[PDB]
Amino acid sequence: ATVSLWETVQKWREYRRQCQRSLTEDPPPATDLFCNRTFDEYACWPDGEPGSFVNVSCPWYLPWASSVPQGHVYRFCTAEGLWLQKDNSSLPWRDLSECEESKR
């Protein structure tokens, strides 16, 4: 209901702070092949299991987060323990379609 760039930036900085805490303190995975946890600036990713989709909840700082409570963003962890990318130079594949704002 409230629009505030200021409030939204502050929620994003809090989500980033909580994420950094998880990245620092979460125990290492159950060995030793896993895609590595990261904060991509939009979402906080945990370590991935090889050959798996990894889903995290839509970031709670989104102004419309309460409209998408069961939505998830996805990455894919390849069997080699690397995040799926696309081509040569690209960022990791991500699907955030469930977290988008519009009704349609």
């Binding site: 629009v3 505030s4 760039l5 939204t8 930036v9 994003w12 991509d40 600036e41 939009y42 989104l62 102004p63 960022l91 955030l96 704002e101």
Partner: peptide
């Protein structure tokens, strides 16, 4: 009203900025 609607767009732009990689950059 108008300024609230324009702030709303600024906020969408901020979110698009993060999706595009944010401070990374």
């Amino acid at each position: 009203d108008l300024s609230k609607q324009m702030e709303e767009e600024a906020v969408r732009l901020f979110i698009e900025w993060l999706k595009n990689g944010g401070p990374s950059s």
